Amino acid sequence: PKETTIFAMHLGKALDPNLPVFVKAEKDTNIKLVNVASQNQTDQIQAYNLMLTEGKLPDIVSYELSADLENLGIEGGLIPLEDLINQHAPNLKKFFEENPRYKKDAVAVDGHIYMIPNYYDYFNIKVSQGYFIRQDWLEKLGLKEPRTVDELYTTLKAFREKDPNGNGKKDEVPFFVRANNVRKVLTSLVDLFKASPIWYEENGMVKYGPAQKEFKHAIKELSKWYKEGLIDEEIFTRGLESRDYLLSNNLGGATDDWIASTSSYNRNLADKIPGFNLKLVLPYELNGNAKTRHARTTYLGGWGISKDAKDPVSLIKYFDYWYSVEGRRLWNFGIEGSEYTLVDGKPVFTDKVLKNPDGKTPLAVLREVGAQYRLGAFQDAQYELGWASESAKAGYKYYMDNDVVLDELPILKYTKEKSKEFVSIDTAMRAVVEEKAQQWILGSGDIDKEWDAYIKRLENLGLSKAEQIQNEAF
Ligand SMILES: CC(=O)N[C@@H]1[C@@H](O[C@@H]2OC(C(=O)O)=C[C@H](O)[C@H]2O)[C@@H](OS(=O)(=O)O)[C@@H](CO)O[C@H]1O
Ligand SMILES: [Ca+2]
């Protein structure tokens, strides 16, 4: 039993090493994790920043913001991993040889590997979020599927004013999202208006979404839709239970969310809410623009080994376990005999996952046993296809066939000094954007009056320089 400290959080939950997935990994690797994040910590960014002030770093550092994680490596807080991998991690060594695109995500500008990313199975499923609407509410109200942003507005107004759930109460929440921070709230609200809360590419040049006039229009419209009760009054506070609560209580009319898990609700709620039909639609058009910027990235976050770890060879072997056939299946599918059984060598989920007796969705069940816990593992799209509905599978093809998805801007990497400057500027601007976007949507500030000063604020923090660093690394 080798006691190993780790900082690990995901989706607001500190990693619990007693979950079945990590109990099994413990038996197989003799690595017994001890989290330095405590169970009452739910803000991963503030916990990470606090962790950096505490003196000694944990043996393993996991973080969702890979640019900050790689900066920690450039400063010597994380050790280079490439020699440890070549000598001691045959599964990772093979993975990097077989996947040069993924290897590029792992290599810093100085040539060192400071982190193993948590890879999506990008080359098998590359879409992420889509737009959904309560088709049973459309039929109930005699309305057609809205195809433009303006028609969506009118439709949501009808959802709010005309009692589609039939209980004589003005309780409908026409449009809702799912998030545990402000960035994720904005992410699923501003794409409607063809804006972006982050950096994006136009025509070979990298630009900052929140500084564009499309973002101003998005926020201005959302403030109006907020006042009229068309978007959830609790958008910024409802948290990750939002979709579960609003759909299962028959309150929510439409959303922008991950395709497979959102498609799970039709079967999940079929008995509780007879006729429930939350249906995927193509992104609503705005003046002929039919695109969404929602796309899966090649990876999200990662983990590394800190300079303070006593036994890095043992830890790279732990990293390598998740890239073995058995370790990767464990991370993706859960426990054999509980979450899945092997049928002709291939995992097939059990009733516990696919028809959960406590009314849980399949992915919620998997996360509760420790599967899909973001660290530095390699997702297997067969896990997702194993529980995705037929409508979800058609939905992937629907979005791809109709060419509505724009690829995400890759997470660029920089030389040491530029990488210190960029993350400093990007972090500072992020705080300003999330402050003003909330005030503007909630009605406590006037965006028409304040936009120009906001821009100047971003410029004062270094927006021009950040863009310049961006276009150098592109
Ligand atoms: C790598 C990871 O854990 N990413 C989180 C997302 O997880 C994906 O969600 C779905 C889905 O259908 O919802 C399918 C993909 O296979 C998953 O990897 C997702 O987490 S959650 O929806 O399961 O809670 C999003 C939610 O914001 O968060 C990512 O971190
Ligand atoms: Ca009602």
Author numbering: 27 to 500
Task: Copy text from the publication.
A periplasmic solute-binding protein (Smon0123) captures unsaturated GAG disaccharides with the 1,3-glycoside bond and delivers substrates to an ABC transporter localized in the cytoplasmic membrane. Smon0123 is composed of two major domains (N- and C-domains), and each domain has two small subdomains. Each domain included a parallel and an antiparallel β-sheet surrounded by many α-helices and formed the α/β sandwich structure. All the crystal structures of Smon0123 so far determined include metal ion in its molecule, suggesting that the metal ion contributes to protein folding.
Crystal structures of ligand-free Smon0123 (N-28/C-5) and ligand (CΔ4S or CΔ6S)-bound Smon0123 (N-18/C-5) were also determined by molecular replacement with CΔ0S-bound Smon0123 (N-18/C-5). Compared with the structure of CΔ0S-bound Smon0123 and that of ligand-free Smon0123, the N- and C-domains of ligand-bound Smon0123 were 47° more closed than those of ligand-free Smon0123. There was no significant difference in the overall structure among Smon0123 proteins in complex with CΔ0S, CΔ4S, and CΔ6S. Unsaturated GAG disaccharides were bound to the cleft of Smon0123 by hydrogen bonds and van der Waals (C-C) contacts. Smon0123 strictly recognized both residues of unsaturated uronate (ΔGlcUA) and amino sugar (GalNAc/GalNAc4S/GalNAc6S). An aromatic residue, Trp284, showed stacking interactions with both ΔGlcUA and GalNAc/GalNAc4S/GalNAc6S. The numbers of hydrogen bonds between Smon0123 and unsaturated chondroitin disaccharides are 9 for CΔ0S (ΔGlcUA, 4; GalNAc, 5), 14 for CΔ4S (ΔGlcUA, 4; GalNAc4S, 10), and 8 for CΔ6S (ΔGlcUA, 4; GalNAc6S, 4). The numbers of C-C contacts between Smon0123 and unsaturated chondroitin disaccharides are 50 for CΔ0S (ΔGlcUA, 27; GalNAc, 23), 48 for CΔ4S (ΔGlcUA, 26; GalNAc4S, 22), and 53 for CΔ6S (ΔGlcUA, 28; GalNAc6S, 25). The sulfate group of each substrate is situated close to the binding site of Smon0123 and directly forms hydrogen bonds with several residues of Smon0123.
